[PDB]
Write a protein that binds this ligand. Structure first.
Ligand SMILES: *[C@H](O)[C@H](C[C@@H]1CCNC1=O)NC(=O)[C@H](CC(C)C)NC(=O)OC[C@@H]1CCC(=O)N1CC1CCC(F)(F)CC1
Ligand SMILES: *[C@H](O)[C@H](C[C@@H]1CCNC1=O)NC(=O)[C@H](CC(C)C)NC(=O)OC[C@@H]1CCC(=O)N1CC1CCC(F)(F)CC1
Lengths: 305, 305
C-alpha cells in the first residue's frame, strides 16, 4: 500500500524568472534578481588560485561596478548593467539599473533544522532541476549540486509570497551541502573557503519521525502503536543520549494526533522501541525510521490541509 | 556519505503557464492549454451520480460548446471561450478561441515502465506542487494526488521541448495512481470508471536497480561487487521467477559500466544475491534494493552528463 507521500517541491516558475548568471573575471555562477538587486555568493570574486585563504574585504575593494557581468537567459533575455556593489556576509548585493519586472512578492527568512524547503538548481543562470530537502540538525542538506551550481536558491512559499531561505555555496566531505541565508550568514559553523572544515554530527529529527509514524497510521499501518507512553520530558532526555533531536510539539503535530486518536507520547515510546530494531517488520515500506517528511507534509499530502 | 541523489523534477514554469481550470456543470478539474486546444479528462462530463457506468458517447453528444467553462488563473488571467469539442479516448479535446501565448515547444509521447517523469500537481487550475515518479511495471505511479487533481500533467523535457506523457485520472485501491497518455489511452489495462479494477502485480525495475548499484560504486560503496557474473539471458530467466523486470541494457547503462569499470553482468549477479538479503549491510543508506532512480538520473546527477 502506497503512503501517498512523495518529495513535493513548490512549482518553480516564480523563482525561475528571477535567476541570472553573474560573472566576475574567470568565475561564473548564479544569482537571484529581485527588484533592482542581484544576490550571489561572494566567492565569484575569488580567483580559483586563492579560494583557500581569500581576503574578501580586499577583493571587494578591488572590484568596480564594471567588474561584474549580469545576464538573464530564459524567457525575457537581458544584460543587466551593475550600478552598485556591496558585500553582506558571504553574499554580494549588486545593484542593477533595471528592476526585475517579474519580481514576486517575497521575504527573506532562515530555515530551521527539520524544516523543508524547495531548491531550484541552476547552472550558468539556467534552471535545470528542482527538489526538496530538509535542513539537517548539523546545518547541511542532502542535495544534488555539481560544479557551477552555486547561487542556486532555496525557498518556501506562504500563499503567493516566496520566502527565500538558502543560497547554495559548497559541498562538504561527506557529500552533503550547505549555503547562506540572505542575511549573508552561512548555515551552521561553516565558512565559504576551500579548506577542511569540522562537520558536526547529524541527528534524527524526532518531530519528523513522529510525523511519519502518523502518516503510517493514516494509511492503516499501526502495528507499532501500544498503550505505552513516554513523556516529552523523558523522551528528550533519551534523545540526547541517542542522536535524536529533542521533540518540540506544534499545532501541525497536534492535528495529526486528533485525526488519528493516537497521542504524541505513544509515538515517542514507539520511536524508542523501533530505534532498537523493527524486528523484521516494515513501516510504509521502510525498515528504518524516516525523518525527511514534516508534520506539514503529512497534513497537506495525506489530509489535504 | 550522501550519494548526491535526490528526486529531481524539471523546472515547472513552462508547464505552469499552460494549466487551466475546466468546469462542466457540477464537475471541475484541470486542463492543459496548448495552442488553441485544451485537454482534460473526459469524466468532467459525468455527474458524480453516474461515474460507475457512464456512457461517455452519450454524454459527449449531450454537450454543446457552451457546456464547458475554461479559466486561466495564474500570471495572465483569462476566460477562454470554447468553440469546439471532441473526445479522444479518455480525454476531451476542447478548441478555444485564443491560442496560449505561452505555449512551449512540445510533443506527446508515451512513457515506458521504469522511466521517470515530472508531475505538476494542480487543483482548480492552480499549480500546487511538483514531484517526479517512475512508471511502474504495472502501469501505475506512486504519486501524491487528492480530490480535484485530475488533469494534472506529467512530462519530460528534451532541450527546450516538453514531452507530455501523462494526464492524471484516478487512484487505485492500493494508493497508487494512473492516468492517460495524450492519445487518450489509459496506461495499463485501467478504465476511467468508478468500479473495482483488477490491478496487476508490480515488479522491481531491474535496469534501475543496476543504475542504483552503479551510483553506489560511484560513491565509493562497492562491497557487493564480486568477480562473479550472471549473463543477461540467465538473469532474465531468473527475473521472471522472482518479480523482476527483464533487463534491457542501454547506452546510459553502458556509460556507467565504462566509468566504474564494473560490468553489468557483475551487478546482475549482485542483484540475485542481494535479493536474498543484505546480511545486515547497507547500500547508500538502504537495506533494500532501490529501483526509483534511472540510469539517466545517475549519469546526470552524479556524473554531470
Ligand atoms: C559553487 O558552484 C560550488 C558548488 C560545489 C561544487 C561541487 N558541489 C557543490 O555543491 N562550490 C564550491 O566549489 C566551494 C567554493 C568555496 C570557496 C565555498 N567549494 C566546495 O564546495 O568545495 C568542497 C570540496 C570539493 C568536494 C569535497 O568533498 N569538498 C570538501 C573537502 C575538500 C577537501 C578537504 F580536505 F579540504 C576536506 C573538505
Ligand atoms: C480526479 O480529480 C480524481 C483523482 C483521485 C481522487 C483521489 N485521488 C486521486 O488521484 N479521480 C477520481 O476520483 C476517479 C474518477 C473516475 C471516474 C476515473 N476515481 C477514483 O480515483 O476513484 C478511486 C477510488 C477512491 C479511492 C480508492 O481506493 N479508489 C479505488 C477503489 C474504490 C472502491 C473499489 F471497491 F471499487 C475498489 C477500487
Amino acid at each position: 500500500h502506497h503512503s501517498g507521500l512523495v518529495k513535493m517541491s513548490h512549482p518553480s516558475g516564480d523563482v525561475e524568472a528571477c535567476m541570472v548568471q553573474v560573472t566576475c573575471g574567470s568565475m561564473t555562477l548564479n544569482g537571484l534578481w529581485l527588484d533592482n538587486t542581484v544576490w550571489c555568493p561572494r566567492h565569484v570574486m575569488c580567483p580559483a588560485d586563492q579560494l583557500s585563504d581569500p581576503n574578501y574585504d580586499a577583493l571587494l575593494i578591488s572590484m568596480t561596478n564594471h567588474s561584474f557581468s549580469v545576464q538573464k537567459h530564459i524567457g525575457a533575455p537581458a544584460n543587466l548593467r551593475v550600478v552598485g556593489h556591496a558585500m553582506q556576509g558571504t553574499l554580494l548585493k549588486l545593484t542593477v539599473d533595471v528592476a526585475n519586472p517579474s519580481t514576486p512578492a517575497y521575504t527573506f527568512t532562515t530555515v530551521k533544522p527539520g524544516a523543508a524547503f524547495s531548491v531550484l538548481a541552476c547552472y550558468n543562470g539556467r534552471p535545470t532541476g528542482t527538489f526538496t530537502v530538509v535542513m539537517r540538525p548539523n546545518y547541511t542538506i542532502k542535495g544534488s549540486f555539481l560544479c557551477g551550481s552555486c547561487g542556486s536558491v532555496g525557498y518556501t512559499k506562504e500563499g503567493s509570497v516566496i520566502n527565500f531561505c538558502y543560497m547554495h555555496q559548497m559541498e562538504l566531505a561527506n557529500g552533503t551541502h550547505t549555503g547562506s541565508a540572505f542575511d549573508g550568514t552561512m548555515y551552521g559553523a561553516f565558512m565559504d573557503k576551500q579548506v577542511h572544515q569540522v562537520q558536526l554530527t547529524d541527528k534524527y529529527c524526532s518531530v519528523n519521525v513522529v510525523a511519519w509514524l502518523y502518516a503510517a497510521i493514516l494509511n492503516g499501518c499501526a502495528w507499532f502503536v501500544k498503550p505505552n507512553r513516554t513523556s516529552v520530558v523523558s523522551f528528550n532526555e533519551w534523545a540526547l543520549a541517542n542522536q535524536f533531536t529533542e521533540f518540540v510539539g506544534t499545532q501541525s503535530v497536534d492535528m495529526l494526533a486528533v485525526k488519528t486518536g493516537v497521542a504524541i507520547e505513544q509515538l515517542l515510546y514507539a520511536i524508542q522501541q523501533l530505534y532498537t530494531g523493527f524486528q523484521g517488520k516494515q513501516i510504509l515500506g521502510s525498515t528504518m525510521l524516516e525523518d525527511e517528511f514534516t508534520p506539514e507534509d503529512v497534513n497537506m499530502q495525506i489530509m489535504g490541509v
